[PDB]
Design a protein around this nucleic acid. Sequence first.
DNA 1: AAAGGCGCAGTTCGCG
DNA 2: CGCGAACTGCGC
Length: 759
Amino acid sequence: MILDTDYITENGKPVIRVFKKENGEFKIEYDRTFEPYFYALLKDDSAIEDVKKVTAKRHGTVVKVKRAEKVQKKFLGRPIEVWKLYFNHPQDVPAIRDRIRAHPAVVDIYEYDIPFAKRYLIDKGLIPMEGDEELTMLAFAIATLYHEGEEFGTGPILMISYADGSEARVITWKKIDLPYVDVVSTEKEMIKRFLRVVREKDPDVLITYNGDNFDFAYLKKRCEELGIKFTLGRDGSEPKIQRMGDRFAVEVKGRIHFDLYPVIRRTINLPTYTLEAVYEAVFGKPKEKVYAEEIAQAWESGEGLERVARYSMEDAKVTYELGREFFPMEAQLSRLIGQSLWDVSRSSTGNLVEWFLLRKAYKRNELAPNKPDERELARRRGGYAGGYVKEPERGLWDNIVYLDFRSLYPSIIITHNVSPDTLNREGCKEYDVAPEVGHKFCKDFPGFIPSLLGDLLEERQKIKRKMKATVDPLEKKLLDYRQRAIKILANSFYGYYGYAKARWYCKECAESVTAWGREYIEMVIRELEEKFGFKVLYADTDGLHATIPGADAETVKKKAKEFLKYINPKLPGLLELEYEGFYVRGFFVTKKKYAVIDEEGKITTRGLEIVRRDWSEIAKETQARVLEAILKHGDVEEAVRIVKEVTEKLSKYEVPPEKLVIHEQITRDLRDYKATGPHVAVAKRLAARGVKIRPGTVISYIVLKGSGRIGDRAIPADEFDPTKHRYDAEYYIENQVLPAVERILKAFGYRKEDLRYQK
DNA sequence: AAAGGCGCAGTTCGCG
DNA sequence: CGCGAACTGCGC
Ligand SMILES: *OCCCN1/C(=C/C=C/C=C/C2=[N+](CCCO)c3ccccc3C2(C)C)C(C)(C)c2ccccc21
Ligand SMILES: [Cl-]
């Protein structure tokens, strides 16, 4: 099984290293014959000689073109003749490419920023993570001594805990009386002993939770203090820091540093992403949190250090359990995209698509379009019309069916051959013309993307049948990830088309997909209303909620199925409208905001405050109580009584702090903000103390009593203590609970005033 | 357990 | 006072 690739340089020459695990053994293969290259489009072919005469400097050495060869390629399906320029070292390319592009004979240049190790994987058609090779893993976590306002890395590391399938242990330099604690003499001997543990176990994967940003950087700081070479690599190297957009990520050579944080952050939508929250969210079991104050407290005085030890052990253990569960999904996705799990696990869907397309472009001899420069990126600034959203008919309705398309957008892309190479092609025999926006798509040949996207859907269908046929639970689980990875990739082509930084960016294509999607859904609604007697209550993009106002549960069900059998022949083959489910009651508040209840009492909520992290738990739970009363039974007057005792509790300061926390994400550097709402106001104070604030950070704040501008009376949720603070009962009644329950109860004639306690 | 796409409902706060 | 830009997070 291929894990990863890199290169090193021997005597000036690049040597690819392929890191593999074969038959229980880690292997390194070397490739010294691989030549870096990019392509040049010339005016005259006779100009190639002056292009080879071009030179540049790399650390004082003169870099030149090693050799060039004229090649025949396709560019967006059209024939193109370019010169492949070979170099001795991949580092020659950045050094020399600008001066070559500048040359008066060079129309343009291509494929000059594909990193050498990634290029190797693509050109050699190698796929990482193939096979059944079992990989050993090791999780680890550290615990640091922290005090208010301190610089990063100055305080020592108190604990390093680790875990694999067999055990979870803790290394520390004070005496703690627990079976799983290992006591050594100093911080240095603790870090040294951890190194020894890792080298001993020799894990293929190192799992951390936010290790990319904290654990490796802090171990780095400490190791430089204590004079310790931090050797974690299988080749005996220190962990390598790589840049990833604004963020940092950490490699460990010969191993896979699987940082769970960016994976979970992409995968699951949660209010907070603390290790405790994630574990609770994934495994259902709760995990107790010990704060850096309590930790610091205990260390100064050997007090409650068994609780801190337990905490540290649990960090590593829990980190290992989540690692084991998220890894396989990430490996299938890596196998699909054809890039290392290290890269893939830290990539957006858009980046995954691009790596997929770069590899497919190589297979089919399609020259890749470049990433857009600053200028072109400005011409990609305009937006376009998206999904259709129907203004709902507000209120409570009985006996609702939800009908929808599955994979609307990729079906459209395949059906109509939507593709930047099929867009606006002259002299074709057959065209598909997008509604409203009017773009023509040639149908005489499968386009680059639709071809790839059609292969995906077939392969997925093959895997689903294997999955359903198999009696082997392990194979079933594996195929399930495989088919889930294909879906994600299939679903990302659309977004990619309209993503301004894409090589295969195409606004006209993304517009056409959305215009078709509107045509189809609006047609389905029109037929359902006119042909059958249904009242369409609401619709969004690819699906709709409907019912027949007089009808009982059985009539609506029958009539819905019968409408599908009527409507589906009238849609293109790939576009199948499906019956998703039946709901005894539903309540639609506004666009994007509704909630339904099914026959088994289960309630589904969409868009309402209940599902948002920037609404306090008291406003959300209460809004839930109100919805439950109105959905489960028909009792409005119950919901009002619910709101009565909640606002009454709040006004008398009896609701715990836990239910008052509001969560809001920082989305940019704090300097770039131009309007300072409470979450920025809190974040700015934190940063003033010495707390690292990065885009993506979630601020948890509570609103204390005392009035005026909200951001002033807001404090971080952790620093709230009832012995010192009184919360703003007025804010949580008037700005949280009452507005949240008003959305619903205003539909029944209740205003904010008759729901309060006082006045 | 889709979303670097777009369509929306909504809160904060300074503004005249 | 009402208004509107700034800003967040949702549904697809
Ligand atoms: O989409 C949110 C994350 C889903 N997800 C995964 C979830 C694994 C869950 C395991 C749960 C579990 N429970 C709780 C069941 C609650 O409905 C439980 C209770 C009693 C005994 C055993 C268990 C186990 C531990 C089975 C995984 C599969 C990790 C995954 C991978 C990739 C993306 C999302 C998810
Ligand atoms: Cl280009």
